[PDB]
Design an enzyme around this catalytic site. Structure first.
Site, PDB file in Angstrom:
ATOM      1  N   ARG A  75      33.713  36.240  39.517  1.00  0.00           N
ATOM      2  CA  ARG A  75      33.151  36.624  40.807  1.00  0.00           C
ATOM      3  C   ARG A  75      32.650  38.058  40.711  1.00  0.00           C
ATOM      4  O   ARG A  75      33.418  38.972  40.420  1.00  0.00           O
ATOM      5  CB  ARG A  75      34.210  36.522  41.909  1.00  0.00           C
ATOM      6  N   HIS A 119      28.367  43.531  48.745  1.00  0.00           N
ATOM      7  CA  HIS A 119      29.688  44.116  48.613  1.00  0.00           C
ATOM      8  C   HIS A 119      29.605  45.614  48.880  1.00  0.00           C
ATOM      9  O   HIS A 119      30.003  46.443  48.056  1.00  0.00           O
ATOM     10  CB  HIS A 119      30.313  43.826  47.239  1.00  0.00           C
ATOM     11  N   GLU A 164      34.306  41.182  52.785  1.00  0.00           N
ATOM     12  CA  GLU A 164      35.027  42.038  53.723  1.00  0.00           C
ATOM     13  C   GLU A 164      34.190  42.815  54.739  1.00  0.00           C
ATOM     14  O   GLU A 164      34.154  44.055  54.727  1.00  0.00           O
ATOM     15  CB  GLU A 164      35.920  43.004  52.941  1.00  0.00           C
ATOM     16  N   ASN A 293      40.693  37.198  50.999  1.00  0.00           N
ATOM     17  CA  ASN A 293      41.148  38.371  50.253  1.00  0.00           C
ATOM     18  C   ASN A 293      42.458  38.819  50.900  1.00  0.00           C
ATOM     19  O   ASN A 293      42.544  38.915  52.127  1.00  0.00           O
ATOM     20  CB  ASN A 293      40.148  39.533  50.355  1.00  0.00           C
ATOM     21  N   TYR A 295      46.091  41.510  50.188  1.00  0.00           N
ATOM     22  CA  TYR A 295      46.853  42.450  49.375  1.00  0.00           C
ATOM     23  C   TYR A 295      48.207  42.786  49.990  1.00  0.00           C
ATOM     24  O   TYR A 295      49.207  42.898  49.280  1.00  0.00           O
ATOM     25  CB  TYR A 295      46.076  43.753  49.175  1.00  0.00           C
ATOM     26  N   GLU A 353      40.129  37.392  46.210  1.00  0.00           N
ATOM     27  CA  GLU A 353      40.650  38.705  45.835  1.00  0.00           C
ATOM     28  C   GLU A 353      42.131  38.841  46.151  1.00  0.00           C
ATOM     29  O   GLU A 353      42.560  38.591  47.273  1.00  0.00           O
ATOM     30  CB  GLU A 353      39.926  39.848  46.561  1.00  0.00           C
TER      31      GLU A 353
END
Ligand SMILES: OC[C@H]1O[C@@](CO)(O[C@H]2O[C@H](CO)[C@@H](O)[C@H](O)[C@H]2O)[C@@H](O)[C@@H]1O
Lengths: 447, 447
Positions: A75, A119, A164, A293, A295, A353
């Protein structure tokens, strides 16, 4: 030892400005991040992506590295400034040629290229004209999408419109800690809307110019919002943040409407008159899968990235922390996936991600040991496997990132790669996690 | 701007095992740290000082950098393992020659050599025979001091016996987190006494074999202990820790007696029978100055604090370094004021002060560490205030000229003014190096 579903996709992810370098080569003109990074005080130590990992020149070596790691997909993002300098005008073939060769090499290696159109590297000229808060930007993005599809549609079969948008709109125009660095609550909401509009217009353009079997998606960093206490107030705080972090995008993109509670929460800031009749319908296009995504979780109870939610307070979630100081909590990923499965049962999910930053170093013997990253990825993959066991339709996982790179406002101070990069030389050194992940990718088994 | 006395000495410091490398060359045999580092789980990622910064080979380049930075002195330690492999017997000329050449090179460029006899690299054979808990070690150390003085006395005029004996005794034999890795409270206390004894016997040897103008000292990491609250109980905890961390050494070395409260505090552990008649007078030798090492305050309310199990440690308030230690220059100012009060006729030299930060070399080959500049500037300001208030501080040595092997932390922590890319050994002076050079040149501290 957990076994993943047949066909599960194992890959790694990167972004153009974060790894490419060659910022002023082959026709590329400045993006908002070039301008932002060159602005004193905006990026740590004044770092810029002028050179980064020099992937623009080392691309062949990087693909070979992916093949050695046995990855099934890659990606990456397309640099708008290289493909269509200034954000308007004809396509620049030399810019597109870089991606043509990259995609061709990936395919020759049996690696599936997955391209993200945007991005964050918005051509500076479009920001000069108003940026995302300006409607024209959405139309310009749709034209760019067509240009990209026309040129790479025969080699790239999986497309992502935006990566995002929450960051682009609220950090870029809300708190100003991301390019272009503006701080206006209404500008941030306008930006969010035009990202929704641009996304839909782009999917329309892609469907029209890509082969029937091509896949289209969008990548959202889905905040998993939790309340600090059982208090009824903290539950309202969760609603408010969930609305601003996720639903301001999933509403338009996946449901064709802005959440009513969000409109109410922001009534003191705007009337949303910039939402032209028909914009919601255009933003709401059928996707083949949703890119997720993640985290770390979120814990809650004029320059803010949360317009209208000034009453809300944020707290450090429990757990060990990464170099970013973010809490490590794989349960957030499991819960997040279950929420998505419940809200959008028919929409396949792909983790586009997930990863972590740790203070990695190469020792005198030339090795880079990152057992902490292995633990982080292993634990989060276990959470994904659990969600899958419970019914979640997850089809792939992309480790952010194949390479240590320019981590935006943090500059090169944060390393997220499976592969270490000695910046002065550009030398790549696969870390322990690269060897571990390669095994997972080759066996489909998580030890 | 603050102006330091024109005669104030500006330098940088290092230690043998932390920077030399060439662990098995020219006759050098394993020190307790070679053995400790080879022990699984003892050092971060299994790092060892086998190569470190390769200084044993590249030293000429390092002295050249010091000269480039205009430093007036260089503090380094002598590797007993290179000079006398087994801790006894014939001295190796190759080992002595390395230090003779080093000292000559420093002098040729106007840099004052300051040598530390012992910075933790005890010959393994001496540990096999009992280590510091065994009295013979103190005797052997003194004979080693004479060997070093005879070989380097015509060049090195400033000598330090031991560096941070607290760590050697309590971390090495108490909690076992440092070489040799033993865990016995009595062993730790015996080691402390023999370090006190060894120090005294070494000074006697140095005074005897060195020119009359030679200076002798000892370097102690003086813990600045503060109580969490104003309770008397917390105040007594401060007393107990101050006794174990500082007075167990300053009492014997500077006053010829162990503090009575320390003897009482440890009565349940030992009767100190190993303290033989005459030992206190032997440990109590006149010094030219006291070397002070300081990095962060200590807040209180297998352990390395024998008999202090009723004491709890806390994170002192303030910004933190890569070590997670609190940054508080006031601790240094106060510590200096206390030393000036307790030992007014004893000159003070800051032999170690610095900070670890997660430094990195960017694509352009630069290493920016403004956080380190801030740390050093702030602490130097504290030193300047102490001087103005009456403290007799005559020099400052930044730990360390180079990023190096940080003991149990391996290469994960960088303290250097000069960055080191370990795989290649490449040196890159950081921003702090250029800033510090200016201070060392003019003696003017820009605030
Ligand atoms: O019914 C909407 C449905 O069909 C799709 C094509 O599968 O798109 C069409 O409908 C949109 C909304 O009116 C148009 O904007 C688009 O151009 C058109 O093809 C899906 O996107 C949607 O789920």
């Amino acid at each position: 030892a957990l076994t993943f579903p047949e066909g599960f996709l194992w890959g790694s992810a990167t972004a153009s400005y974060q790894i490419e370098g060659a910022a002023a080569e082959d026709g590329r003109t400045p993006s908002i991040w070039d301008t932002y990074a060159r602005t004193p005080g905006r990026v740590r130590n004044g770092d810029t992506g002028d050179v980064a990992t020099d992937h623009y020149h080392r691309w062949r070596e990087d693909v070979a590295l992916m093949a050695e790691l046995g990855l099934g997909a890659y990606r990456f993002s397309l640099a708008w400034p290289r493909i269509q300098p200034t954000g308007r005008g004809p396509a620049l073939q030399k810019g597109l040629d870089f991606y043509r060769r990259l995609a061709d090499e990936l395919l020759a290696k049996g690696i599936q290229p997955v391209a993200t159109l945007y991005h964050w590297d918005l051509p500076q000229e479009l920001e000069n004209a108003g940026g995302w808060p300006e409607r024209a930007t959405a139309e310009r993005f749709a034209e760019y999408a067509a240009i990209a599809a026309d040129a790479l549609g025969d080699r790239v079969k999986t497309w992502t419109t935006l990566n995002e948008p929450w960051c682009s709109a609220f950090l870029g125009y809300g708190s100003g800690v991301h390019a272009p660095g503006r701080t206006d609550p209404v500008a941030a909401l306008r930006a969010a809307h035009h990202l929704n509009l641009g996304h839909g217009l782009a999917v329309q353009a892609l469907r029209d110019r890509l082969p029937a079997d091509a896949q289209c998606s969008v990548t959202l960093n889905i905040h998993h919002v939790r309340p600090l206490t059982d208090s009824d107030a903290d539950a309202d705080a969760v609603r408010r943040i969930d609305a601003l972090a996720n639903r301001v995008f999933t509403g338009p993109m996946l449901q064709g409407a802005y959440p009513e509670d969000l409109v109410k929460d922001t009534a003191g800031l705007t009337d949303w008159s910039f939402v032209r009749d028909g914009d919601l319908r255009l933003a709401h296009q059928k996707l083949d899968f949703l890119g997720v995504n993640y985290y770390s979780p979120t814990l809650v109870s004029a320059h803010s990235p949360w317009p209208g939610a000034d009453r809300v307070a944020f707290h450090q979630p429990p757990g060990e922390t990464t170099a970013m100081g973010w809490a490590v909590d794989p349960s957030g990923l499991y819960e997040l996936l279950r929420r998505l499965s419940s809200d959008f049962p028919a929409l396949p999910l792909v983790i586009t991600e997930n990863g972590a930053a740790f203070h990695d170093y190469a020792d005198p013997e030339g090795n880079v040991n990152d057992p902490e990253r292995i633990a982080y990825v292993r634990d989060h993959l276990a959470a994904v496997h659990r969600a899958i066991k419970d019914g979640s339709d997850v089809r792939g996982y992309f480790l952010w990132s194949l390479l240590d790179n320019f981590e935006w406002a943090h500059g090169y101070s944060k390393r997220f790669g499976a592969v270490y990069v000695d910046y002065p030389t550009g030398t790549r050194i696969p870390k322990a996690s690269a060897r571990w992940y390669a095994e997972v990718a080759r066996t489909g088994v998580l030890p």
